């Protein structure tokens, strides 16, 4: 009946159409700040001098971009890892030139996304659920921290965190390969395995359940109407799914325990993607992919090339062309 | 920008024709129940 208590009950109420919660109290304002600034910047921000060389890159639609080329451009290399809020600029015109919007957007998003994960724990508690959905989500979250915060920290500049745009994403991943040889890094290989395997097991599981649905409908109606929301009986025959897939491979490589099966679905892409987030996070400190350049030589000592050397010719073309006016000395050390 | 003029009509139809088709089937579905 007390005023603070009634506020607390509304924040944590399981009856709001969207749950708020204490994590929500921080998530909502920060995700709105990040979203609103993002939308305005993508449409209308003027060009940004990302690399600190007075060579501004146009990222917004009204400055001659389309949906595929546009981006909020990372902040200036002149700033490095320095905090650059609006009130540190002599004006919005200066803040826009040097790429202030990027910092605002990423810091608010990373905060709000972190609270999104917390919110997932919180509602799980209010509803009497088990708690670990949020752990699943830590994998994507970790990935976003790596490209927007950890890699900039290791390389000394937000100019090198990932642009917020489609073509800027590709720029970031090409330059990464040139400098880190990510393809030859095992943690990236486990990411591909987690993502390919995830898509595979998604398709497998969806096709196995779908294959073993119990006839509940006629030819003239969606089978989906054979399940009614909240029915207590299962809607497929798992023993039939087991019996088909066990014979497709062999019995003991198929799940007949639906709990094990669904835990397996969860763990494979979560773990794969933890590792790939760890890949970006450790390559941020320049522990790069395997280097087999000139590893094979002949009895005289001629180099005998392999595919690794061909990959290196490609990495070299990326290397020598990226940020083509920004290097004055022969080694690109960060 | 020097952009393909027909891109506009193409985009509008691309959105409009499929969307209108769905709405037609939705509304006549609701009018049944």
């Amino acid at each position: 009946a007390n005023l603070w208590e009634r506020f607390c009950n509304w924040v944590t109420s399981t009856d709001n159409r969207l749950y708020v919660g204490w994590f929500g109290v921080i998530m909502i304002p920060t995700l709105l700040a990040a979203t609103i600034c993002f939308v305005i910047a993508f449409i209308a921000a003027p060009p940004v001098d990302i690399d600190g060389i007075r060579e501004p890159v146009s990222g917004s639609l009204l400055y001659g971009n389309n949906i595929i080329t546009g981006a909020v451009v990372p902040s200036s290399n002149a700033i490095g890892l320095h905090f650059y809020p609006i009130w540190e600029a002599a004006s919005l015109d200066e803040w826009l030139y040097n790429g202030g919007p990027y910092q605002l957007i990423i810091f608010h998003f990373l905060l709000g996304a972190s609270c999104y994960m917390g919110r997932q724990w919180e509602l799980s508690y209010r509803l009497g659920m088990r708690p670990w959905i949020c752990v699943a989500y830590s994998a994507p979250l970790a990935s976003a921290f790596a490209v927007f915060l950890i890699y900039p920290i290791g390389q000394g500049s937000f100019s090198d965190g990932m642009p917020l745009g489609i073509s800027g994403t590709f720029n970031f991943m090409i330059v990464f390969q040139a400098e880190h040889n990510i393809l030859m890094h095992p943690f990236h290989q486990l990411g591909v395995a987690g993502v390919f395997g995830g898509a595979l097991f998604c398709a497998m599981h969806g096709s196995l359940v779908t294959s073993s649905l119990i006839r509940e409908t006629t030819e003239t109606e969606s089978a989906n109407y054979g399940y009614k929301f909240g029915q207590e009986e299962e809607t497929y025959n798992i023993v039939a799914a087991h019996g088909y897939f066990g014979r497709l491979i062999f019995q003991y490589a198929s799940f007949n325990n639906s709990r094990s099966l669904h835990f397996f679905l969860a763990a494979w892409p979560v773990v794969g993607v933890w590792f790939t987030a760890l890949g970006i996070s450790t390559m941020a400190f320049n522990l790069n992919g395997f280097n087999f350049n000139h590893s094979v030589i002949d009895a005289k000592g001629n180099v005998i090339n392999t595919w690794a050397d061909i990959i290196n010719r490609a990495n070299l073309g990326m290397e020598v062309m990226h940020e083509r006016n920004a290097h004055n000395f022969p080694l690109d050390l960060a | 920008m020097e952009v393909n003029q027909l891109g506009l009509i193409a985009t509008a139809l691309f959105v409009l024709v499929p969307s209108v088709f769905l709405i037609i089937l939705y509304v006549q579905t609701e009018s049944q129940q």
Binding site: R17, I43, L61, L62, N66 | -
Partner: peptide, 30 residues
């Protein structure tokens, strides 16, 4: 005109979001 088209589509998606959440078929038990 390209700018207006891009933003128009993006605006329709946001509106659609609004209706899919607050004006959904409400799921009903059994």
């Amino acid at each position: 005109m390209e700018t207006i088209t891009y933003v128009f589509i993006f605006a329709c998606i946001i509106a659609l979001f609004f209706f899919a959440i607050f004006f959904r078929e409400p799921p009903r038990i059994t």
